[PDB]
């Protein structure tokens, strides 16, 4: 599924990431805009054999099983193609265990180099919310 810009807001405002951690709505769109273009299909390889799924391109170095990464870890415990399904619920849930893990968004290197420090509000502008 390709989301729109204020339907992904409201998702992740209904599955409670508004100010998570202190980070507010504006900062994981924008996230999920630079990581995934808001295509919960995206997948992206790393160089170091392990693969990026979905709207947050979650990891399978650390967070999901894709049964190629060989010595990873499963910390969100479900499959990595679980986080490509139209239902965002088990990437926000995964989501909410990373950016609890210390380093906070940082974790996304998209949104360290593309949305930390600009005015993160403008993604959530014109939605009813
Ligand atoms: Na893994």
């Given at each position: 599924?390709?989301?729109?810009?204020?339907?992904?807001?409201?998702?992740?405002?209904?599955?409670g990431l508004?100010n998570y951690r202190?980070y507010?709505?504006?900062?994981?769109?924008?996230?999920?805009?630079?990581?995934?273009?808001?295509?919960?299909?995206?997948?992206?390889?790393?160089?170091?054999?392990?693969?990026?799924?979905?709207?947050?391109?979650?990891?399978?170095?650390?967070?999901?099983?894709?049964?190629?990464?060989?010595?990873?870890?499963?910390?969100?415990?479900?499959?990595?193609?679980?986080?490509?399904?139209?239902?965002?619920?088990?990437?926000?849930?995964?989501?909410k265990?990373?950016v609890?893990?210390?380093?906070?968004?940082?974790?996304?290197?998209?949104?360290?180099?593309?949305?930390?420090?600009?005015?993160?509000?403008?993604?959530?502008?014109?939605?009813?919310?």
């Amino acid at each position: 599924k390709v989301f729109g810009r204020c339907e992904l807001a409201a998702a992740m405002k209904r599955h409670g990431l508004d100010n998570y951690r202190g980070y507010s709505l504006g900062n994981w769109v924008c996230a999920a805009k630079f990581e995934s273009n808001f295509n919960t299909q995206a997948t992206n390889r790393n160089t170091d054999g392990s693969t990026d799924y979905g709207i947050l391109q979650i990891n399978s170095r650390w967070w999901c099983n894709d049964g190629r990464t060989p010595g990873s870890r499963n910390l969100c415990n479900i499959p990595c193609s679980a986080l490509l399904s139209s239902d965002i619920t088990a990437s926000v849930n995964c989501a909410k265990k990373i950016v609890s893990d210390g380093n906070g968004m940082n974790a996304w290197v998209a949104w360290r180099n593309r949305c930390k420090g600009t005015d993160v509000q403008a993604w959530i502008r014109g939605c009813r919310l």
